[PDB]
Amino acid sequence: ITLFVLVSVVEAFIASGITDPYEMYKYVHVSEVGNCSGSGMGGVSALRGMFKDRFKDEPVQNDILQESFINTMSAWVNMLLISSSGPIKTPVGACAT
Amino acid sequence: AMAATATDKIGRSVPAPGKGILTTAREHHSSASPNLNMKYRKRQLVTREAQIKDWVENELEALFLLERTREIHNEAESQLRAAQQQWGNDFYKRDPRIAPLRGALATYGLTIDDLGVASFHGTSTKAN
Amino acid sequence: VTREAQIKDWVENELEALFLLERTREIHNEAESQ
Amino acid sequence: NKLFVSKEHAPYTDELEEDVYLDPLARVSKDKSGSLTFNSKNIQSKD
């Protein structure tokens, strides 16, 4: 799911004509770029990894737990593209997310 | 008085704690702005309130009648609350020389030294 | 328009009452705030 | 195949990080490298 989020974020910035997200910091402070997107269930594949694959003793990465969190997609977006210190509020609203 | 959230920066460790929440204390110090004195803000508030009552009486003279008195007094209240907000609630929101933390404390005449207790997340981990 | 007129009146009174750079900055900023 | 390009570094260095966080008027400028970064001359400055 994080790959879908990363590609969509990059393409949405391109659709806004912003090819380098750091260009936003020529107008605003780093604390003024927020991320308020979320999911209904998050990384369900990592949930499978920790709830079934670990039960069957199959190789699962030791930090699979963090990849399941619904705010981990926003964390990865910020850690790979945005690098802002602005608000982060991850909603969980099922189909109205 | 305040409630804020912040992300940190580019990186590769998801569970790593960061300093991004430090931005609640951001404050430009290149160069005592009157804004940080409640006496001046209260003075401005009285002035605006006087102007508001003048507007109210003019509009009452210009002014079914029940509905409209309701409306005019309501706009008067709308203007008084806006003035109150500007001069007492978010006077520092537009000032880059006042940090959000300082301004949240100053809304009630408190300084930074009046923050006596810090509740720490204190998770008993070496980095946190 | 009426409130904008009152705002400019406040601005000119406060400019008359009004380091100088800092303060002009401040007054125009309060004007904008209003 | 380079629509997504990951950032290796933040726009500030680790020595300049807290200064950027504590200066609301701090902004990036084009840098030599040609990328957008924060410069110490533009942090907590009167300009």
Lookup: tokens for A46: 């990592």
Under 8 Å CB pairs connecting chains A and B tally to 46
- Would you list the DSSP string of A57-72? T----TTHHHHHSTTH
Three-class DSSP category at A83: coil
Token duo for residue B116: 């006596």
Question: Which residue of chain A comes nearest to D6, CA vs CA?
Answer: A80
Selection from D37, D2, D6, D42 nearest residue D24 by Cα:
D42
> Could you give the CA distance from residue A79 to residue A6 in angstroms, rounded to a whole number?
11
The residue type found at D47 is D
**B15 is written with which tokens?**
């569970």
Distance CA C14, CA C24 (A): 9
Q: How many residues does chain A have?
A: 97
Q: How many CB atoms lie within 10 A of CB D39?
A: 15
The verdict on a CB contact (< 8 Å) between D10 and A83 is: yes
The span from the CA of A37 to the CA of A88, in Å, is 9
Fold designation for B31-98: Helix Hairpins (6.10.140)
Q: Amino acid identity, residue B80? A: L
Listed by number, the residues of chain D in 1-47 with a beta carbon closer than 8 Å to a beta carbon of chain B are 7-10, 12, 17-18, 21-25, 44-46
Active site residue A95: yes
Tokens of B41: 């803000």
Task: Please name the method used to determine this structure.
Answer: cryo-EM
Which helix (H) or strand (E) covers residue D36, if one does? strand D36-37
Q: How far is B23 from chain A (nearest CA, A)?
A: 7
What DSSP line would sit under chain B, residue for residue? ---------S-S-TT---SGGGGGG--------GGG-HHHHHHHHHHHHHHHHHHHHHHHHH--HHHHHHHHHHHHHHHHHHHHIIIIISTTTT-TTS-HHHHHHHTTT--GGG---------S-S--
DSSP A21: G
User: Taking the CB of residue C1, how many other CB atoms lie within 10 A of it?
Assistant: 5
Interatomic CA distance for residues C18 and C11, integer angstroms:
10
